[PDB]
């Protein structure tokens, strides 16, 4: 029907930095061997997408952004055995080939098939499936979900519960899993511990959720926008602090509130100064600090090695440390079992065609997650 | 006898930086209620003592250095209950007050009573027990072991096996414990993993021993002094490489030898470039890098947060993460049960009077650990 044929649809293309997305008519090639073409149903707006627009996260242009989403399999290529047409799925910006050193290591998830580190803007075979007015369009982190139809590698697509509400579970595609996992899986927050969370957007709030789920005694939420505090409290924050209210640097305020520092700190903003503050705020002898935020391209931190010699542990992670393919289905299963809710994270719902308004909402600081419906 | 009296004894005093130690008579005050005066038997020469001489590690002068040692208790304060005159003990440069947040924490060891962070060069009560030519002399990390007699706080001295050969077990006071601990307790090296060890001095070779004890499949010893290779191999290194032998950076040489990088890397030198090579040489997705070497004073590293974001863990530790007072006696009991050997680490034994000569040996790279006899 459309199987084996090229599909003509709409997609939000970014042709230039700092410019609005352009809803364009695009051609989506049929899926090659071990590939899956997906009809998108819902896509969340994550700060990382915006990082590309602003120039903070470098990627080849023109490109179709979007990586937090959920859809339904339209067709599959030769050899596909994990999903079938009609299956509800969530694309994985961090693939899980299952065969590489990293996929085989129980404690890691940054699969060697990824396109995050040194962006090619292509699928795993090094080619593109998108075209627009005679111009090829680059993919984004292997998924390009801001399109009515996208084609992805089989190891970058997870099959989920058939009764799943895609307009909600799409957050498991990035935001929620990243934040939740950063606390429960990466930092391995312990019951009775003290945590400091920098940044209260969709990812940071999911970190607050993770810390509460891990049984943290104190979860101090840090954010320069006091409007983000109510939600942080509802989700588990015991205290909310605004750096702008203090004469002292935020790390010193945090250390004074916590007997020398927190046991676990998380930077969920993407700024060098806040990464430094987060490291400095965890206790020098027993603190752990996790970098979640994506820093601006080519910018380096200035760190004194003594900060680590006394006993600190500094680490970072992509997608909360979750091995994508095996984890996403389980997270959806937990959601269906009502282990956690994502309603608090969805502040706005807009049709895909109003993607620009969704980004305006993010930039304004009012929204957490705006979900786009196709 | 000497109990309750001032003792005039020989000590090695450092009056100025980059100058030989001055061997002379000093007056050592009796210990206070919770202090212990120790007659030194053996003291090891560690690179950290040299860091003070060179100016790399800042501490107030004039000072009596030394921190890796073993002696016999001459007298104790009336409040002392853990050691008695005649007991063989090892002074702990990292104390274990047992009452602070850190001492209560089963996973940390950087007791808040330490004098490592911002050196006062005194005992815990803020005063000094040393005088020479009338002038007060500063202590070093609360222990100052380069003296025939020293006075230390009770929580900074551990009672060890009475049958212990002090000329060997003094290494448990720093070098060995630090190296072994860094691998087994800090990095928590796992069976079948790959490790890279930067620096093959007494501490680095002990890290090799720890990696071996942990069952590492590969232990790549790195050093620009090829004379250290035979011993690295004897202690467990599977391979030995010299950075100077290659045209490309050592981190790339290591990554090419280990499928993208080692699982665990350790810097046991104290230089910025090697701390960077060490971080860069562990796999970006599953590697853990431990800082053991003491960095040069007032110097920063320039790091791109993405090095951590992909999945690396970067941490540091003091004294191999061992809670000093409870661990030192057990480590000696292990030595006495022949669970590990220290012979290979001791390459030179000189009388205390030849301390300057022992330091020249370290500087020339001709020795691993030189032990001084009193
Ligand atoms: N590691 C990953 O795999 C991963 C995954 C998803 C997102 N991210 C990154 O996580 C970060 C957060 O994503 P988000 O979608 O939640 O973004 P967001 O913009 O919705 O949230 C950012 C929050 O940070 C707060 N903030 C900004 N500057 C601050 C400062 N100086 N001090 C304290 N708070 C400040 C903002 O007010 C906002 O509440 C971004 O950098 C994103 O790129 C990383
Ligand atoms: N964390 C701690 O608690 C702790 C404890 C003890 C010692 N230390 C520190 O550990 C480090 C090692 O102590 P040590 O006594 O074993 O010192 P050492 O001088 O005996 O050993 C240093 C080794 O590194 C090698 N080396 C020096 N520069 C190099 C370079 N650029 N590239 C490759 N190899 C190089 C030297 O040849 C030597 O083999 C020192 O910085 C010391 O201050 C720290
Ligand atoms: Zn893989
Ligand atoms: Zn995202
Ligand atoms: Zn030492
Ligand atoms: Zn203590």
From Swiss-Prot, chains A, B:
Provide the E.C. number(s) assigned to this enzyme.
Answer: 1.1.1.1
Q: Which Pfam families match?
A: ADH_N, ADH_zinc_N
Residues bound to NAD(+) are 199-204, 223, 228, 269, 292-294, 317-319, 369
Reaction(s) catalysed by this chain's protein: a primary alcohol + NAD(+) = an aldehyde + NADH + H(+); ethanol + NAD(+) = acetaldehyde + NADH + H(+)
Give residues annotated as binding Zn(2+) 1.
Answer: 46, 67, 174
Which GO MF terms are attached to this record? alcohol dehydrogenase (NAD+) activity; all-trans-retinol dehydrogenase (NAD+) activity; ethanol dehydrogenase (NAD+) activity; zinc ion binding
The subcellular localization recorded is: Cytoplasm
Cofactor detail note: Binds 2 Zn(2+) ions per subunit.
Q: List the disulfide bonds.
A: none
What cofactor is this protein dependent on?
Zn(2+)
Q: Which residues carry this modification: N-acetylserine?
A: 1
Q: Which GO terms describe its cellular component?
A: ciliary basal body; cilium; cytosol; nucleoplasm; plasma membrane
PANTHER family associated with the record: ALCOHOL DEHYDROGENASE, ALCOHOL DEHYDROGENASE 1C
- Other comments on record: There are 7 different ADH's isozymes in human: three belongs to class-I: ADH1A, ADH1B, and ADH1C, one to class-II: ADH4, one to class-III: ADH5, one to class-IV: ADH7 and one to class-V: ADH6.
Q: What does this protein do?
A: Alcohol dehydrogenase. Exhibits high activity for ethanol oxidation and plays a major role in ethanol catabolism.
Similarity annotation: Belongs to the zinc-containing alcohol dehydrogenase family.
Listed under subunit, the entry gives: Dimer of identical or non-identical chains of class I alcohol dehydrogenase: ADH1A, ADH1B, and ADH1C.
In Swiss-Prot or TrEMBL terms, this protein is called Alcohol dehydrogenase 1C
* Protein species of origin: Homo sapiens
Q: Which gene encodes it?
A: ADH1C
């Amino acid at each position: 029907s459309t199987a084996g044929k090229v599909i003509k649809c709409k997609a939000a293309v970014l042709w230039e930095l700092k410019k609005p997305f352009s809803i364009e008519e695009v051609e989506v090639a049929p899926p090659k061997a071990h590939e899956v073409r997906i009809k998108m149903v819902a896509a969340g707006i994550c700060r990382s997408d915006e990082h590309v627009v602003s120039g903070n996260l470098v990627t080849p242009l023109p490109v179709i952004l979007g990586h937090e989403a959920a859809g339904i399999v339209e067709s599959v290529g030769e050899g596909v055995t994990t999903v079938k047409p009609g299956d509800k799925v969530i694309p994985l910006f961090t693939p899980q080939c299952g065969k590489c050193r990293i996929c085989k290591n129980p404690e890691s998830n940054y699969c060697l098939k990824n396109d995050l580190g040194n962006p090619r803007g292509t699928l795993q075979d090094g080619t593109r499936r998108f075209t627009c007015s005679g111009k090829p369009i680059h993919h984004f982190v292997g998924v390009s979900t801001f399109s009515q139809y996208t084609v992805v590698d089989e190891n970058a697509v997870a099959k989920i519960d058939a009764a799943s509400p895609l307009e909600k579970v799409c957050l498991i595609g990035c935001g929620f899993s990243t934040g939740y996992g950063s606390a429960v899986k990466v930092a391995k927050v312990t019951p009775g511990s003290t945590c400091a969370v920098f940044g209260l957007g969709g990812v940071g709030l999911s970190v607050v959720m993770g810390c509460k789920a891990a049984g943290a005694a104190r979860i101090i939420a840090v954010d320069i926008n006091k409007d983000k505090f109510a939600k942080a409290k509802e989700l588990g924050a015991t205290e909310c602090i605004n750096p702008q209210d203090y004469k002292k640097p935020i790390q010193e305020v945090l250390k004074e509130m916590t007997d020398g520092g927190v046991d676990f700190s998380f930077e969920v903003i993407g700024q060098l100064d806040t990464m430094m503050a987060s490291l400095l705020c965890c206790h020098e002898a027993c603190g752990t600090s996790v970098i979640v935020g994506v820093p601006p391209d080519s910018q380096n931190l200035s760190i004194n090695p003594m900060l680590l010699l006394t006993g600190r542990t500094w680490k970072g992670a992509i997608f909360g440390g979750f091995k994508s393919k095996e984890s996403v289905p389980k997270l959806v299963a937990d959601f269906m079992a009502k282990k956690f809710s994502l309603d608090a994270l969805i502040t706005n719902v807009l049709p895909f065609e109003k993607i620009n308004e969704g980004f305006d909402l993010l930039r304004s600081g009012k929204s957490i997650r705006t979900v786009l419906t196709f």
